[PDB]
Design a protein around this nucleic acid. Structure first.
Ligand SMILES: [Mg+2]
Ligand SMILES: [Mg+2]
Ligand SMILES: [Mg+2]
Ligand SMILES: [Mg+2]
Ligand SMILES: [Mg+2]
Ligand SMILES: [Mg+2]
Ligand SMILES: [Mg+2]
Ligand SMILES: [Mg+2]
Ligand SMILES: [Mg+2]
Ligand SMILES: [Mg+2]
Ligand SMILES: [Mg+2]
Ligand SMILES: [Mg+2]
Ligand SMILES: [Mg+2]
Ligand SMILES: [Mg+2]
Ligand SMILES: [Mg+2]
Ligand SMILES: [Mg+2]
Ligand SMILES: [Mg+2]
Ligand SMILES: [Mg+2]
Ligand SMILES: [Mg+2]
Ligand SMILES: [Mg+2]
Ligand SMILES: [Mg+2]
Ligand SMILES: [Mg+2]
Ligand SMILES: [Mg+2]
Ligand SMILES: [Mg+2]
Ligand SMILES: [Mg+2]
Ligand SMILES: [Mg+2]
Ligand SMILES: [Mg+2]
Ligand SMILES: [Mg+2]
Ligand SMILES: [Mg+2]
Ligand SMILES: [Mg+2]
Ligand SMILES: [Mg+2]
Ligand SMILES: [Mg+2]
Ligand SMILES: [Mg+2]
Ligand SMILES: [Mg+2]
Ligand SMILES: [Mg+2]
Ligand SMILES: [Mg+2]
Ligand SMILES: [Mg+2]
Ligand SMILES: [Mg+2]
Ligand SMILES: [Mg+2]
Ligand SMILES: [Mg+2]
Ligand SMILES: [Mg+2]
Lengths: 99, 208, 71, 138, 83, 124
RNA sequence: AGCUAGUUGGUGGGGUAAUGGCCCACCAAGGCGACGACGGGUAGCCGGUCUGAGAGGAUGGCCGGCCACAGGGGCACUGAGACACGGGCCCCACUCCUACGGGAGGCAGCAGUUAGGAAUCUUCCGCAAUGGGCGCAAGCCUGACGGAGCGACGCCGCUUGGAGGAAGAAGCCCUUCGGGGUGUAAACUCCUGAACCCGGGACGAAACCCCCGACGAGGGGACUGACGGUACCGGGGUAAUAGCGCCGGCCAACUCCGUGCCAGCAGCCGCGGUAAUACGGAGGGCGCGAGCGUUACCCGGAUUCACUGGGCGUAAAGGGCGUGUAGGCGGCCUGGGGCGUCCCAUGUGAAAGACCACGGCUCAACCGUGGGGGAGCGUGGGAUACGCUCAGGCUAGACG
């Protein structure tokens, strides 16, 4: 399988490049408790079609850049600005966390 | 290797008869029969309350001395028994019995366990057609054990055989009294043996 | 064995330290922190700076002795 | 927040057992109902029903006890000695066919939510399936 | 090159060889591709040597090469046998 | 606490304090001696205890206890550390082994032998 | 606590077996971060190993995988493959020769010297086996490997006799002076016959070669041994190394003399300052045993970092409270999706080990054969109770 992953477009600030947030849920190896664990990904998109706030299917791919190893297969749900915004807020807070 | 040296002393220390001389430990002389008390000075001192570890330890010592063994060997045997499926105490005992010297003793090819071991060592006993010289030989059931052909002629063995002529041989074994031979048939049980043991205690001691 | 090389020398009590460790200016020469004997401790016997006590001194290092005799 | 419902129910049951009132009231779920059914089947409670308190559905619990006891500490013999919700919300545990824990060696029971409905230990073993370890009772 | 060879396991004086399929540049003890048979030199057992024939044949077909001892063993146990 | 807390932080592992800087966990250490002297114990006990100030091939300046009843230790005596607190003496953590180097077997010991490193009397 | 400027993305090119910010030219100005970045320290990593009831924890020696580095650093070349352990160049650091201009080197290969250090091995024999590599082949090479050497370094196996033998010698020790202990131990009788010498003596090794068969299959023949005259078998054949720890409690095993908080012992409580079951000695005993104890270090016991499985009024311990962000967590009903989760199938989980069974070395360790298990992960299918998710409603929560 060319591994198949579900996640949201958090950023377009780029030519052809999309930023994806996969919230993979996993069990902890020890305490049982399952954690929402987020990893950022960078996908090539030859259209700029996919906009700020879309859940998309990200596929394991041959690399195009120093960490950019996925093509977008297809759109799932368009326009859920909720999950976008959370991440943005977290990022903002990160600036506030320092000092 | 061997304990070697003063024997009936161990019996005395234990307080229950060993039959470890064989005869003599059978005659009024094991010291158990004439003298029945701890060895050394305080041999006649009013009994100290044995701490609960102590009783167990004593039992273990009794058992280990009974068959005449190194302790490391014994430990290994115990471990093996534990590893095996079943009743560890019984199975362990059986395995212990299943050692060659013990077998020799119990079939009465020699009248004492030490003696049996000695015999085994020098090139006397023959396992299914070949001589074996190792006390720690594990003899698996349905096995035939003989006296050696050119060692067939010694007087001591004959005498021992005669002593074992008439009286019963342990249920799990059987002997030929003419062709200087014997079969080990079944792997011996708990109730099949009249030992002074309480193997449970030994097992408990080992746990720690 | 009990190796006896112990020097049984007298001395005037100099400096009262803690634990009843009395600097004793000996008849031998230099003062050391020589402490009080167990016997003395048992019998409750107070030494003051102004007594000629016997200090049982060791040959390994003359830095520590033992006040044995009462004054 | 009445946060976990199942756990709350279990707690209520335990309380009832402790203070000996043959019936108790708890809010109404399908899950809860299923659990109660299982309990009834096993024998930990005489029964139940679902009535109404304040225009809100409610599951009554017809408890069980053992015979009135002898001697000091009269306290009627307790059948639910102990209860404990294992899959505490957030600390969610999941077990398989080779992981159903033999509870009390067989004299209490575990409760395992499976693909095949809401069901019990022996049943699970028979059906060879695993699930969620909601609860332990003995 | 891909080689069919014995590998020494066992003990001192008491040898034991595995008829194996492995790579040229490998340790004689190394991570081989495939265990295909076994042989003990000491003839100690009635079932001293045994190969699995089909797998050996398959290996040969791909183009594996037997070293000399291995080849001999194969011959003995009938793999180069043609009917 | 709650498992969530654990997940967030983790349990602060028991960082095992070293009882002995014989360095490296060096099971022995050989070194040379500054001063052979004698020390008062404590509040419970009183006895002139035979000690050695010892410099080590590790590079530390540590005191060390001498065993037996009659020692033969000088100063630039080459000595071997055993390690293992005596209770009484404070700052004191290491024994010396008698039996090798500039600590030889205590003579007139026939019972407790090996611990003091003294050879066997040839029996008649 | 912020880091980052080839740094993140772009177009083109170059480079490469091949993607690529690998690198370059130029444009964009991002990217990662408290779901722990960067920095510091530490550290090969694993199959494993030890432990542990397990979960774990620690460890990663050998043995197998894989990385990385062959004085330190940096680079290429050649080739199928290196940025090249016993191949190159160059700078630095060092030891060697120098007719002072300059070169030689690299044992983290085996063996050993040297140093550190508590501590670690023979400047060993062999190409016989297996593997390597060349060669048509014979053959040649092989400190891979096989073995021997040394070390109780670890594990296992065996010897240091056994059968008699006094209501109890001596020796030595206590005594309540009768006696007891040591102790069937001894001596002495009988027997055996490790050591030891002689007689033989391997299995490991049948190929590659040669001929008949086509140089195929198949058939016959020959040569081949470091271990090693070893193992082992045949005959004889001597009673033929016992030690160390502890002896107050834990903890198995107690008395006497010496000594007088001294000398000392100690793992902790602590013993010792005149009758010390704790110190020195002597017997006795106990523990194991060709070993036992000390020390280091790890796990256990510590459910004393607690997931199984601990707590927080007074013992360590609730922050001074509020608001509030991320986060965590969530009522009832119905439906779908099926991500978690479960199940079934398989693919994988190399071998070695660990586990069972059986077999082999006279047993065992060791070693082989065969099985089984194996957390986890991939794929195909399903299940839908439970979390998640999307949709609709509900009023028990909340708010008005
Ligand atoms: Mg041994
Ligand atoms: Mg003195
Ligand atoms: Mg540039
Ligand atoms: Mg390109
Ligand atoms: Mg870069
Ligand atoms: Mg560093
Ligand atoms: Mg590690
Ligand atoms: Mg390795
Ligand atoms: Mg390299
Ligand atoms: Mg270099
Ligand atoms: Mg370099
Ligand atoms: Mg080439
Ligand atoms: Mg090239
Ligand atoms: Mg190089
Ligand atoms: Mg070397
Ligand atoms: Mg040297
Ligand atoms: Mg040195
Ligand atoms: Mg070696
Ligand atoms: Mg040679
Ligand atoms: Mg070859
Ligand atoms: Mg030539
Ligand atoms: Mg070798
Ligand atoms: Mg040896
Ligand atoms: Mg005798
Ligand atoms: Mg010979
Ligand atoms: Mg003798
Ligand atoms: Mg001592
Ligand atoms: Mg003690
Ligand atoms: Mg004493
Ligand atoms: Mg040891
Ligand atoms: Mg807890
Ligand atoms: Mg607590
Ligand atoms: Mg407090
Ligand atoms: Mg607050
Ligand atoms: Mg929130
Ligand atoms: Mg939520
Ligand atoms: Mg395996
Ligand atoms: Mg296997
Ligand atoms: Mg066998
Ligand atoms: Mg809704
Ligand atoms: Mg209101």
């Amino acid at each position: 399988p060319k591994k198949v992953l579900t996640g949201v477009v958090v950023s377009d600030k780029m030519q052809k490049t999309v930023t994806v947030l996969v919230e993979r849920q996993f069990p902890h190896p020890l305490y049982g408790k399952v954690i929402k664990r987020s990893k950022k990904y960078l996908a090539h998109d030859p259209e700029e079609k996919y906009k700020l706030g879309d859940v998309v299917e990200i596929i394991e791919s041959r690399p195009i850049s120093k960490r950019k190893r996925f093509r977008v297969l297809r759109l799932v749900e368009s326009g859920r600005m909720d999950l976008v915004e959370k991440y943005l807020i977290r990022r903002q807070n990160y600036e506030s966390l320092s000092k | 290797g061997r304990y070697i040296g003063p024997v009936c002393r161990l019996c005395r220390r234990e307080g229950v008869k060993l039959y470890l001389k064989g005869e003599r430990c059978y005659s009024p002389k094991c010291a158990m029969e004439r003298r029945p008390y701890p060895p050394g000075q305080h041999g006649q001192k009013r009994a100290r309350r044995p701490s609960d570890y102590a009783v167990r330890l004593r039992e273990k010592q009794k058992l280990r001395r009974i068959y005449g063994i190194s302790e490391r060997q014994f430990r290994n045997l115990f471990e093996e028994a534990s590893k095996k499926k079943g009743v560890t105490g019984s199975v362990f005992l059986g395995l212990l019995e299943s050692r060659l010297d013990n077998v020799v003793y119990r079939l009465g090819f020699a009248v004492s366990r030490r003696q049996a071991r000695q015999l085994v060592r020098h090139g006397h006993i023959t396992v299914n057609g070949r001589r074996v010289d190792l006390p720690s030989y594990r003899v698996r059931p349905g096995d035939e054990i003989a006296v050696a052909e050119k060692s067939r002629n010694l007087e001591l063995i004959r005498q021992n055989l005669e002593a074992m002529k008439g009286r019963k041989v342990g249920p799990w074994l059987s002997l030929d009294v003419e062709g200087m031979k014997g079969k080990f048939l079944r792997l011996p049980d708990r109730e099949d043996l009249a030992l002074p043991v309480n193997e449970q205690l030994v097992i408990e001691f080992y746990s720690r | 064995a009990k190796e006896k090389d112990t020097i049984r020398t007298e001395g005037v009590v100099t400096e009262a330290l803690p634990n009843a460790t009395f600097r004793v200016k000996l008849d031998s020469g230099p003062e050391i922190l020589a402490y009080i004997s167990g016997k003395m401790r048992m019998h409750y016997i107070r030494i003051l700076p102004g007594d000629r006590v016997v200090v049982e001194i060791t040959p390994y290092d003359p830095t520590r002795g033992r006040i044995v005799y009462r004054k | 927040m009445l946060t976990d419902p199942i756990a709350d129910m279990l707690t209520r049951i335990r309380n009832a057992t402790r203070v000996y009132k043959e019936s108790t009231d708890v809010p109404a779920s399908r899950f809860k109902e299923e659990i109660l059914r299982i309990l009834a089947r096993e024998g930990f409670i005489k029964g139940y029903e679902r009535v109404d308190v304040d225009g809100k559905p409610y599951l009554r619990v017809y408890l069980k006890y053992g015979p009135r006891r002898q001697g000091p500490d009269p306290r009627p013999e307790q059948v639910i000695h102990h209860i404990r919700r294992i899959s505490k919300p957030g600390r969610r545990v999941y077990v398989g066919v080779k992981e159903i824990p033999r509870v009390r060696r067989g004299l209490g029971i575990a409760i395992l939510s499976t693909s095949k409905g809401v069901l019990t230990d022996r049943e699970a073993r028979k059906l060879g399936v695993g699930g969620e370890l909601i609860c332990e009772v003995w | 090159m891909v080689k069919i060879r014995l590998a020494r396991f066992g003990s001192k004086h008491n040898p034991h060889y595995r008829i194996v399929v492995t790579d040229a540049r490998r340790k004689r003890d190394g991570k081989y591709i495939e265990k295909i048979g076994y042989y003990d030199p000491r003839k100690t057992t009635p079932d001293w040597l045994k190969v699995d024939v089909e797998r050996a044949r398959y290996w040969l077909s791909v183009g594996a090469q037997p070293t000399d001892t291995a080849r001999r063993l194969l011959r003995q146990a009938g793999v180069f046998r043609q009917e | 606490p709650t498992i969530n807390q654990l997940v967030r932080k983790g349990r602060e592992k028991v960082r095992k304090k070293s009882k002995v800087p014989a360095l490296k966990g060096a099971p022995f250490r050989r070194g040379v001696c500054t001063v052979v002297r004698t020390v008062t114990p404590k509040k419970p006990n009183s006895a002139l205890r035979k000690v050695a100030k010892v410099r080590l091939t590790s590079g530390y300046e540590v005191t060390a206890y001498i065993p037996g009843e009659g020692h033969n230790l000088q100063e630039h005596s080459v000595v071997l550390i055993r390690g293992g607190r005596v209770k009484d003496l404070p700052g004191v953590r290491y024994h010396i082994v008698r039996g090798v180097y500039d600590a030889a077997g205590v003579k007139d010991r026939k019972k407790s032998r090996s611990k003091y490193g003294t050879k066997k009397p040839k029996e008649a």
